[PDB]
Design a protein around this nucleic acid. Structure first.
Lengths: 25, 108, 129, 196, 216, 105, 86, 101
RNA sequence: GCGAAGGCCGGGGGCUAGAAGGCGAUCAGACACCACCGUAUUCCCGGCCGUAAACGGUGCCGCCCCGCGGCCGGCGCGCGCGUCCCGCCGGCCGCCCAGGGAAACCGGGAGGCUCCGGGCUCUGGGGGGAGUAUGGCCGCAAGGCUGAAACUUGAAGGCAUU
């Protein structure tokens, strides 16, 4: 399910991006 | 694999229809002479003639055994039935449906 | 819910005429409906009409001769200046010479030509061609 | 209202029909038997045969009228009608394209059509639409009237009804003309119309 | 070669029982032989139109097979227009087949008048709608000064129909001209079927002048 | 005649059809023409024009079919005209397949 | 009443005047091949003999496809007198 | 597009339906989609049934017949040839092939 | 306010199945499918979440609407009379004539609509970028809801035919 797997990669990047934002908050 | 082709079958069927009288049921050899007759058909080559006559033998045996190419020799009987009128007519000779119309057949 | 009773009526009238059925029945009787039918009788589009009373809405049976092409309503009733009954005929009627557009006017429910003679205009009730 | 015919029709079973009834044919049926068979009113059948005969008489060339029937039971009868009358015949299979293919071996342009069974003779009815042929149909109680000008309601299945109906039509067309006088009996016998 | 009637109508047509093409379209006659359209307008024949020669391909084991398809707008400026389509291996066979089809389906145009009446019908009688494929064309009556303002292709159909003035409105894939010309033709074909208030007096139906009852 | 007509710039379609007509006027049962080569394209194209029924194989064709090949030489280069004509009615030989039945007696 | 459209001077035009289908009073088109014409003869007092005058009607294919003609025929003829009105 | 108007499921006025299992796949399929055959067959092989019956000391003991229902998933059935891929016209027929055994 | 499943957070309970995790074959690799074992979970109770190919991929109320069949409930008519026959009303369905559509197909509508207007809400406007960035809110989280642009590109798509 490439659409499903693509939204899982987006969700992973969005988790890492929000976490990195928090380190520099 | 000896399946008589339409070319052999079409010619053979016409020959029985044209001259059912000339042909005989168990005789390929008589049929070959009738088929080879200059008047009956012009078959170029020996093989086609030999085969067409073989097909007439089977077809002739079949059209003598039963009406299996129309047979005028048998059409008269069919025509006799076509003109046949039973002398006593079976059908010339729900109950209240006639009473309903107004004229009562089998009144009462 | 049932809002424009005329639309119901005319749709059943056009549909019944399409299959040819000689008589069509309209469930609610209205002054505006009867007047559209009277205009249709005046131009001969409907053969005859009668209203059976139920002490309620009142029911209408319309005798159709078989000569009606289409009859429609315009919602909402748009106010038409006497100047604009020119433009409305062009987009809502088949040809300038034939076909009828009916507008409610203070003088009464009248055809486009009659209100063009009086040089007055009202709100469109609907159109019968 | 021929009393002599109705007794014969009662034996022939033209009064009876299939249990399914179409809305179009509802008018003709008087009622049903408890078992669900449907009783066509017999006088409607008479006022139908005569009505078809009046239409059929208008065709000045007799063979312009074309009869079709794939139903083996009625095959003798359509031919017998054609011999006693002078209509043309299309018996057995329809050889599709007869009406609209000009080079069809049997290509005809009839002015009238006689379809024995609306369902059994389905192709002919559609083709008659393409070439402006109005069509008369012998029909049952469950008969769709698609592309049928006039329909005669008979048992349209039993051999005795199917043959008798054609006999009634043939006698009626001739009686309207000359041939057999309106009052005297026909020399042709109803029985020879029915196939066995 | 000459002419031998393969059609009962054709036999009557050469026999001269029927005069004019209109009477055949009155009695709703199916027309199968092009010889009846040519014989009705023999002198100078009539104008035809080459439109949309096309090259359709049907794939087979070796590959696509190219067959040329052409559409023809046969018409003369009297109110008779026929559009027909023929597909054949060569362009020459296709144009001839389509021309034969276009002549076969010649249909009567009501033509008609705008508000002004003088004596020359110049426009379609009423707004006319036809849909072929995805395109719907609307043929609206126009004033005599205004000409045929339309797509270059449907303009010709309305000219080869003697309709000097028309208001056109085409919606859909008009670029698919084969469908576009069909919609104009379909609108024109059913112009007599639309009933105007003038056709409201019942008359005739006597059988005597019918071309179907006519036996030569 | 075809090689001359083609070399004289007569159009390919008409020219093959003129020959096709001559066999039909003569009554020959089937004529075909397969001009092939750089026919109006950088690549080679083959234009086969044919009218009527033509047998293709068997011993009969050797003694019942007429074949002729010419090489035309237009400005483009070599083109290959071909004509095949089949007549069942030629000299005193019958196509072997057709049995001839004509009368009741 | 001159059926047909007329120019201001007069001169009814409309060369093809279509036959109005009898049941629906709807004009029959040029290519209405399904549309048909049926004539029913007139019968004399003397043994229902044909008098050679027949009422005829035009019937559109659309009514025929529905099947409405079999009942329309009876109604039209009944009023004409042709059929036994009953 | 819609290959089947029933969408592959005899589900009408339901919203959700019970779940069942492919006998071999052990897949989970909605009850409506499941092939569902009912098979009644002899407990012993029919070839050996006569000899077993004669050997059966009991007078008039009929051989017991097993009664079971076999349900398979679409994928499972196509491989096991319980149902066959059919032409677009043949799909519309809903009657058992060659006339429950 | 309600909302499948999975998830969560406090309490239970715990067979089975079983994401993770471990193994055993396979294969070039297999760490995937197939076997074996097995935690979270599944089950309950109180909360949270707020999503599904949540689909019938078809908003809701209103009218007209062509016949033919089945099924469920209520009622009525008639007769041998039976859970019969025929309707009516509300559903659940199949097949379709018209009509419609680019078709597949809808036809109790996707009809009555280029001859376009019953009422009322929601959404869409070539393909990506991107459901991303950022801002708001909501959530315990997971995330939900809202939501770009710069820029890139001449195609993306539907249904049918071979």
């Amino acid at each position: 399910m490439r659409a499903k797997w693509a939204k899982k990669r987006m969700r992973k990047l969005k988790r890492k991006r929000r976490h990195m934002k928090a380190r520099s908050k | 694999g000896k399946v008589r082709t339409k070319t052999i079958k079409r010619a053979a069927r016409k020959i029985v229809e044209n001259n059912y009288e000339s042909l005989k049921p168990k005789d390929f050899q008589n049929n070959k002479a009738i088929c080879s007759k200059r008047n009956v058909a012009i078959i170029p080559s020996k093989r086609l003639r030999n085969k067409v006559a073989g097909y007439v033998t089977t077809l002739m045996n079949r059209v003598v055994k039963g009406p299996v190419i129309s047979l005028r020799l048998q059409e008269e009987e069919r025509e006799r039935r076509d003109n046949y009128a039973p002398k006593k007519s079976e059908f010339d000779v729900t109950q209240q449906m006639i009473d309903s119309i107004g004229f009562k057949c089998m009144s009462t | 819910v049932r809002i424009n009773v005329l639309r119901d009526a005319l749709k059943s009238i056009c549909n019944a005429q399409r299959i040819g059925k000689k008589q069509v029945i309209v469930r609610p009787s209205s002054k505006v409906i009867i007047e559209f039918l009277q205009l249709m009788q005046k131009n001969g589009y409907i053969s005859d009409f009668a209203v059976v009373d139920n002490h309620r809405s009142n029911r209408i049976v319309v005798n159709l001769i078989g000569r009606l092409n289409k009859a429609g309503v315009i919602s909402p009733r748009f106010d038409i200046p006497a100047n604009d009954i020119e433009k409305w005929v062009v987009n809502l009627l088949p040809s300038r010479l034939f076909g009828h557009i009916i507008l409610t006017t203070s003088q009464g429910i009248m055809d486009h030509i009659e209100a063009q003679h009086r040089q007055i205009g009202g709100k469109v009730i609907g159109y019968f061609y | 209202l021929k009393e002599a015919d109705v007794k014969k029709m009662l034996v022939a079973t033209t009064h009876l029909g299939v249990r399914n009834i179409d809305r179009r044919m509802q008018f003709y049926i008087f009622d049903r038997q408890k078992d669900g068979t449907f009783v066509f009113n017999l006088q409607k059948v008479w006022a139908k045969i005569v009505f078809a005969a009046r239409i059929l008489v208008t065709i000045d060339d007799p063979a312009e009228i074309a009869v079709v029937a794939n139903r083996p039971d009625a095959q003798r009868a359509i031919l017998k009608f054609c011999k006693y009358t002078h209509a043309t015949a299309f018996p057995g299979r329809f050889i599709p394209g007869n009406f609209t293919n000009r080079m069809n071996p049997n290509y005809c342009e009839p002015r009238l059509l006689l379809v024995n069974d609306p369902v059994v003779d389905r192709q002919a009815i559609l083709e008659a639409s393409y070439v402006n042929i109005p069509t008369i149909s012998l029909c049952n109680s469950d008969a769709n009237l698609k592309f049928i000008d006039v329909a005669i309601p008979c048992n349209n299945k039993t051999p005795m009804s199917i043959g008798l109906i054609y006999w009634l039509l043939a006698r009626e067309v001739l009686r309207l003309k000359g041939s057999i006088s309106r009052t005297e009996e026909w020399d042709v016998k109803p029985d020879l119309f029915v196939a066995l | 070669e000459e002419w031998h009637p393969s059609t009962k109508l054709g036999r009557l047509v050469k026999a001269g029982k029927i005069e004019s093409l209109y009477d055949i379209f009155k009695y709703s006659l199916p027309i199968k032989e092009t010889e009846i359209i040519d014989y009705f307008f023999p002198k100078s024949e009539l104008a035809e139109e080459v439109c949309n020669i096309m090259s359709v391909q049907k794939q087979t084991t070796a590959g696509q097979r190219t067959r040329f398809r052409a559409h023809v707008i046969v018409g003369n400026r009297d109110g008779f227009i026929g559009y027909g389509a023929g597909v054949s291996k060569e362009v020459a066979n296709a144009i001839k087949k389509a021309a034969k089809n276009a002549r076969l389906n010649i249909v009567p145009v009501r033509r008609g008048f705008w508000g002004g009446k003088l004596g020359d019908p110049h426009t379609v009688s009423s707004k006319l709608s036809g849909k072929c494929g995805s395109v719907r064309v609307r043929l609206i009556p126009a004033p005599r000064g205004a000409g045929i303002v339309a797509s270059p292709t449907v303009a010709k159909v309305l000219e080869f129909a003697g309709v000097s003035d028309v208001f056109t409105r085409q919606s859909g894939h008009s670029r698919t001209l084969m469908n576009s010309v069909g919609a104009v033709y379909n609108a024109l074909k059913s112009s007599y079927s639309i009933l105007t208030p003038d056709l409201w007096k019942k008359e005739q139906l006597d059988h005597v002048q019918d071309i179907r009852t006519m036996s030569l | 005649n075809l090689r001359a007509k083609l070399e004289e710039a007569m159009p390919i379609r008409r020219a093959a059809y003129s020959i096709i007509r001559t066999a039909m006027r003569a009554g020959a049962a089937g004529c075909e023409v397969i001009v092939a080569g750089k026919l109006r394209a950088q690549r080679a194209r083959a234009n086969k024009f044919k009218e009527g029924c033509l047998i293709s194989t068997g011993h009969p064709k050797r003694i019942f079919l007429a074949e002729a090949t010419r090489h035309i030489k237009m400005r483009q280069g070599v083109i290959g005209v071909k004509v095949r004509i089949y007549n069942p009615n030629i000299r005193g030989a019958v196509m072997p397949d057709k049995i001839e039945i004509g009368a009741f007696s | 009443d001159d059926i047909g459209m007329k120019n201001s001077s007069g001169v009814v035009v409309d060369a093809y005047i279509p036959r109005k289908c009898s049941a629906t009073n709807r004009l029959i088109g040029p290519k209405d091949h399904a549309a048909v014409q049926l004539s029913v003869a007139r019968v004399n007092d003397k043994g229902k003999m044909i008098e050679n005058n027949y009422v005829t009607f035009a019937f559109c294919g659309a009514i025929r496809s529905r099947g409405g003609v079999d009942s329309a025929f009876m109604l039209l003829a009944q009023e004409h007198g042709l059929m036994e009105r009953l | 597009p819609v290959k089947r108007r029933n969408n592959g499921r005899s589900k009408y006025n339901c919203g959700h339906t019970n779940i069942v299992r492919c006998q071999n796949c052990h897949r989970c399929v909605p009850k409506d989609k499941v092939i569902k055959r009912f098979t009644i067959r002899n407990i012993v092989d029919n070839t050996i049934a006569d000899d077993v019956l004669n050997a059966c000391v009991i007078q008039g003991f009929a051989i017991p017949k097993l009664y079971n229902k076999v349900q398979y998933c679409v994928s499972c059935s196509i491989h096991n040839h319980i149902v066959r891929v059919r032409s677009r016209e043949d799909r519309k027929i809903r009657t058992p092939p060659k006339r429950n055994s």
